[PDB]
Design a protein around this ligand. Structure first.
Ligand SMILES: Cc1c(Cl)c(C(=O)N(c2ccccc2)c2ccccc2)nn1-c1ccccc1C(=O)N1Cc2ccccc2C[C@H]1CN
Length: 141
C-alpha cells in the first residue's frame, strides 16, 4: 500500500467515468470504490445539495478542502469517515472538471495524499492498515 496510489486510482476512476482521462493492491482499490459508491448512494440527496452549493474556484479550493477535512475528523477518525473523506475529494475533483477547472484535480489529489500521509497514517496503521479496511468492507463486496 501507498496512499498516493490509492488516491490516484480513486480519482482516476471517478474521472474516467465522465470521459475525462486524467494524466495523474487491487482489492484495496476496488473495495474503496464500492465503499465510496455505497456512501454516495446512502447520502444521494445530500450530495446533490452540497454540489448545488459548492461555490468552487481556484481561489477557494484549498480553503474549502481544509475546512471540510478538519470538520470531518473533528470528533476523531473511523473507517466511515475515511470513506467520506475520499468521497469528498472525489466530489471536489468532479466539480472541478464540470466547471472547466480541471487543473485543480492535481492540487486536490496532492492535498488528499498529504493529509493521509501526515494526519491519517497513525490511525490507519494502528487499525492494522488497509487490510483491515478490506476485511471490514468485504461483506458488502
Ligand atoms: C462527520 C461528517 C461531516 Cl463534518 C460531514 C460534512 O459536513 N460534509 C460536508 C461537506 C461540505 C458540505 C456539507 C457537508 C461531508 C460530506 C460528505 C463527505 C465529507 C464531508 N460529513 N460527515 C459524515 C461522515 C461520514 C458519514 C456521514 C457524515 C455526515 O454527517 N453526513 C453525510 C453527508 C453527505 C453528503 C452531504 C452532506 C452530508 C452531511 C451528513 C448527512 N447527515
Amino acid at each position: 500500500y501507498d496512499n498516493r496510489e490509492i488516491v490516484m486510482k480513486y480519482i482516476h476512476y471517478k474521472l474516467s467515468q465522465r470521459g475525462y482521462e486524467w494524466d495523474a493492491s487491487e482489492v484495496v482499490h476496488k473495495t474503496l470504490r464500492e465503499a465510496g459508491d455505497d456512501f454516495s448512494r446512502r447520502y444521494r440527496r445530500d450530495f446533490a445539495e452540497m454540489s448545488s452549493g459548492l461555490h468552487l474556484t481556484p481561489f477557494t479550493a484549498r480553503g474549502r478542502f481544509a475546512t471540510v477535512v478538519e470538520e470531518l475528523f473533528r470528533d476523531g477518525v473511523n473507517w466511515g469517515r475515511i470513506v467520506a473523506f475520499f468521497e469528498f475529494g472525489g466530489v471536489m475533483c468532479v466539480e472541478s472538471v464540470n466547471r472547466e477547472m480541471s487543473p485543480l484535480v492535481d492540487n486536490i489529489a496532492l492535498w488528499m495524499t498529504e493529509y493521509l500521509n501526515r494526519h491519517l497514517h497513525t490511525w490507519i496503521q494502528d487499525n492494522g492498515g488497509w487490510d483491515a479496511f478490506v476485511e471490514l468492507y468485504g461483506p458488502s463486496m
